[PDB]
Design a protein around this motif. Structure first.
Motif, mmCIF file in Angstrom:
data_model
loop_
_atom_site.group_PDB
_atom_site.id
_atom_site.type_symbol
_atom_site.label_atom_id
_atom_site.label_comp_id
_atom_site.label_asym_id
_atom_site.label_seq_id
_atom_site.Cartn_x
_atom_site.Cartn_y
_atom_site.Cartn_z
ATOM 1 N N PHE A 151 0.841 -1.181 0.000
ATOM 2 C CA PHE A 151 0.000 0.000 0.000
ATOM 3 C C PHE A 151 0.884 1.242 0.000
ATOM 4 O O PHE A 151 1.813 1.344 0.806
ATOM 5 N N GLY A 177 -2.364 7.111 -0.475
ATOM 6 C CA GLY A 177 -3.593 7.162 -1.249
ATOM 7 C C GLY A 177 -4.354 5.831 -1.272
ATOM 8 O O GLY A 177 -5.469 5.774 -1.788
ATOM 9 N N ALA A 178 -3.770 4.770 -0.701
ATOM 10 C CA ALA A 178 -4.366 3.439 -0.776
ATOM 11 C C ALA A 178 -5.437 3.255 0.296
ATOM 12 O O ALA A 178 -6.210 2.301 0.225
ATOM 13 N N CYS A 179 -5.501 4.170 1.275
ATOM 14 C CA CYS A 179 -6.464 4.023 2.355
ATOM 15 C C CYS A 179 -7.890 3.967 1.813
ATOM 16 O O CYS A 179 -8.259 4.654 0.857
ATOM 17 N N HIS A 221 -8.290 -0.507 4.727
ATOM 18 C CA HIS A 221 -6.914 -0.130 5.016
ATOM 19 C C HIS A 221 -6.812 1.272 5.612
ATOM 20 O O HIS A 221 -7.409 2.195 5.054
ATOM 21 N N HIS A 222 -6.026 1.435 6.695
ATOM 22 C CA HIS A 222 -5.826 2.755 7.300
ATOM 23 C C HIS A 222 -4.363 3.165 7.448
ATOM 24 O O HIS A 222 -4.093 4.360 7.412
ATOM 25 N N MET A 223 -3.430 2.247 7.722
ATOM 26 C CA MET A 223 -2.111 2.728 8.109
ATOM 27 C C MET A 223 -1.014 1.684 7.941
ATOM 28 O O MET A 223 -1.262 0.484 7.813
ATOM 29 N N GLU A 224 0.221 2.190 7.978
ATOM 30 C CA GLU A 224 1.410 1.362 7.939
ATOM 31 C C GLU A 224 2.172 1.497 9.260
ATOM 32 O O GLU A 224 2.325 2.598 9.779
ATOM 33 N N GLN A 237 -0.694 9.317 13.685
ATOM 34 C CA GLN A 237 0.654 9.141 13.176
ATOM 35 C C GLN A 237 1.609 9.176 14.356
ATOM 36 O O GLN A 237 2.297 10.173 14.607
HETATM 37 C C1 LIG Z 1 -3.736 6.185 3.730
HETATM 38 O O1 LIG Z 1 -3.760 6.204 2.306
HETATM 39 C C2 LIG Z 1 -2.320 5.965 4.259
HETATM 40 C C3 LIG Z 1 -1.735 4.609 3.826
HETATM 41 C C4 LIG Z 1 -0.253 4.451 4.288
HETATM 42 C C5 LIG Z 1 0.583 5.394 3.509
HETATM 43 C C6 LIG Z 1 1.885 4.636 3.203
HETATM 44 N N1 LIG Z 1 1.567 3.158 3.367
HETATM 45 C C7 LIG Z 1 0.253 3.057 4.026
HETATM 46 O O2 LIG Z 1 -0.284 2.055 4.302
HETATM 47 N N2 LIG Z 1 -2.426 6.027 5.698
HETATM 48 C C8 LIG Z 1 -1.729 7.047 6.445
HETATM 49 O O3 LIG Z 1 -1.048 7.829 5.892
HETATM 50 C C9 LIG Z 1 -1.875 7.090 7.958
HETATM 51 C C10 LIG Z 1 -2.807 8.234 8.342
HETATM 52 C C11 LIG Z 1 -2.920 8.300 9.859
HETATM 53 C C12 LIG Z 1 -3.767 9.488 10.303
HETATM 54 C C13 LIG Z 1 -3.527 7.016 10.399
HETATM 55 N N3 LIG Z 1 -0.573 7.306 8.538
HETATM 56 C C14 LIG Z 1 0.439 6.292 8.374
HETATM 57 O O4 LIG Z 1 0.150 5.230 7.952
HETATM 58 O O5 LIG Z 1 1.756 6.593 8.726
HETATM 59 C C15 LIG Z 1 2.698 5.650 8.335
HETATM 60 C C16 LIG Z 1 3.309 6.028 6.993
HETATM 61 C C17 LIG Z 1 4.350 5.278 6.484
HETATM 62 C C18 LIG Z 1 4.918 5.612 5.272
HETATM 63 C C19 LIG Z 1 4.449 6.697 4.557
HETATM 64 C C20 LIG Z 1 3.404 7.446 5.063
HETATM 65 C C21 LIG Z 1 2.837 7.113 6.280
#
Ligand SMILES: *[C@H](O)[C@H](C[C@@H]1CCNC1=O)NC(=O)[C@H](CC(C)C)NC(=O)OCc1ccccc1
Ligand SMILES: *[C@H](O)[C@H](C[C@@H]1CCNC1=O)NC(=O)[C@H](CC(C)C)NC(=O)OCc1ccccc1
Lengths: 305, 305
Positions: free
Chosen positions: B140, B143-145, B163-166, B189
């Protein structure tokens, strides 16, 4: 992040799968416009399969001997012909779900999605590479023939494979959608050799790039090599020779990672010579060769359809 | 024959994916009847993500601040609410492609297909197991959320994941379609621990059965074991304890192969204790735990949808 063997979404192809029955035998066909494509061995009985005379067998058949069903929708056959190892059944109704499509004869080392089907109904979807020896390592049971392989580009489905048979080694063989087999295979129930299968070097390198992009950087070394030096080692481990064209194709991945291709070749050479030491790369304890460079970039820029 | 990690055909789900935009942020939503489900963090800006007050952020939003598009089809939002970590947007139009569906909260060790999407457009499909520690090992990007995980039974799509997070380890976390996270995760985050991830013992055994069915029988030994004896070894290698319920679930595969489950446990114990000796099983040099017993039987009886 993360890296997975990922098939194309199958919905456009699901809408084209039909059941084809000729007497006893049922298999899958592909319904595009007013034509249904299926393996010609739908016309064979148990006895015929050792060495069918397809021309003679098809002569005993008329339009009304082919039963084609799309779900419950019965289609009416108004003409039939044999093109190589495929039958084309002309039907009265154009498929209203026909995607934009092309027929392509794929190159060895390229990948595609397989929609495995039984009785004209989709079972599942998985990615496959066309091996250098023109086999694929699939999952197909009795009744799976006529399942197809495809790629999607934007809105266009490029069909490249139709399933016909399993080889003694447990690998799979089939044709393009013009009915020409990939490789030396013929559609009869005889023992057939695929011959030596080599590893797709450019794909292994692509996947090493994927691995670096995803945090796995342990396999990197302080060494470099030359194309000639590497290719001597390639030949030793039954890998395809690497060419400048391959280097060029890896250029995007090399630039994105800032790792030179010949430096990655030196990494690859150490892996080949010294195994992995019970370590793993992107979840694997073997060198993976069924991701093309394109596959890697697609799964890193998030290309959609 | 052959055994592959095989996703469900995705077409029924493709028809439900939409784009959801709230100010700057775009992600995916799922359009079923007249409701669109998406991750509530669509309402967050860059600053908010460290510790969003979702209740406060959502109060600043009205119906017209949510832009929902299904292809070019603009949908009109006529109501919004937050359920746990998901937003439900009521829209004026019922999705005409809504499949028969259920929402299910899946058990750890069970598998499902992920349709990875960006901007409401399908990118690809792959199988995932819900790990014992309530993570998945996906692919993911930003933008995949709002991409979803599902199973299909006959004609019914059971949605189980959004899907919500990594996580810092590169593994993935998300919710059921009622917005409750699997595991201890929260949608902010921050660094979050998943904790120890154990191997799904019953799935490894299923896959050993798959392997035997497919000709790989070298790992079989003349030994047997007991549940207690095996479970002492399981605990040593961070495998889940095996129970009689697990033995019962493997009964079909055991009967089909004529190999007793405890005999396969003895095989598994040798593999764990002595590695593989650079050999491979169904194309893998590691023990694979993301096939359920059901998965194996489905791919051996050719179940369709
Ligand atoms: C939603 O599209 C996004 C999916 C993450 C982006 C990179 N790989 C994924 O699975 N979710 C988020 O950005 C999430 C938002 C929070 C408010 C829950 N934050 C997150 O997952 O942080 C970890 C991350 C790792 C690598 C790149 C960006 C974020
Ligand atoms: C068509 O559905 C079938 C697919 C085979 C069946 C088992 N795995 C497959 O890929 N194709 C044939 O049955 C084919 C027909 C000939 C006239 C070409 N014969 C064949 O593939 O023989 C090999 C075989 C292996 C295991 C079971 C049955 C057949």
């Amino acid at each position: 992040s993360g890296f997975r063997k990922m098939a194309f979404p199958s919905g456009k192809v699901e809408g084209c799968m039909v059941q084809v029955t000729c007497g006893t035998t049922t298999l899958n066909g592909l319904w595009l416009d007013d034509v249904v494509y299926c393996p010609r061995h739908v016309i064979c009985t148990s006895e015929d399969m050792l060495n069918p005379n397809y021309e003679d067998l098809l002569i005993r058949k008329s339009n009304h001997n082919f039963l084609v069903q799309a779900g419950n929708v019965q289609l009416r056959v108004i003409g039939h012909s044999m093109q190589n190892c495929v039958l084309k059944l002309k039907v009265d109704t154009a498929n209203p779900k026909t995607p934009k499509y092309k027929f392509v004869r794929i190159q060895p080392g390229q990948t595609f999605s397989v929609l495995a089907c039984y009785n004209g109904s989709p079972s599942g979807v998985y990615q496959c590479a066309m091996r250098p020896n023109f086999t694929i390592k699939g999952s197909f049971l009795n009744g799976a023939c006529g399942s197809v392989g495809f790629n999607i580009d934007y809105d266009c489905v490029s069909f490249c494979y139709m399933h016909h048979m399993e080889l003694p080694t447990g690998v799979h063989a089939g044709t393009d959608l013009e009915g020409n087999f990939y490789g030396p295979f013929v559609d009869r129930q005889t023992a057939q050799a695929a011959g030596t299968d080599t590893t797709i070097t450019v794909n292994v390198l692509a996947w090493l790039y994927a691995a670096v992009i995803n945090g796995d950087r342990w396999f990197l070394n302080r060494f470099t090599t030359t194309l000639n030096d590497f290719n001597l080692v390639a030949m030793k481990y039954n890998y395809e020779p690497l060419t400048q064209d391959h280097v060029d194709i890896l250029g995007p991945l090399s630039a994105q990672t800032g790792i030179a291709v010949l430096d990655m070749c030196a990494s690859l050479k150490e892996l080949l010579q010294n195994g992995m030491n019970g370590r793993t790369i992107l979840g694997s304890a073997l060198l993976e060769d069924e991701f093309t460079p394109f596959d890697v970039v697609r799964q890193c820029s998030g290309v959609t359809f």
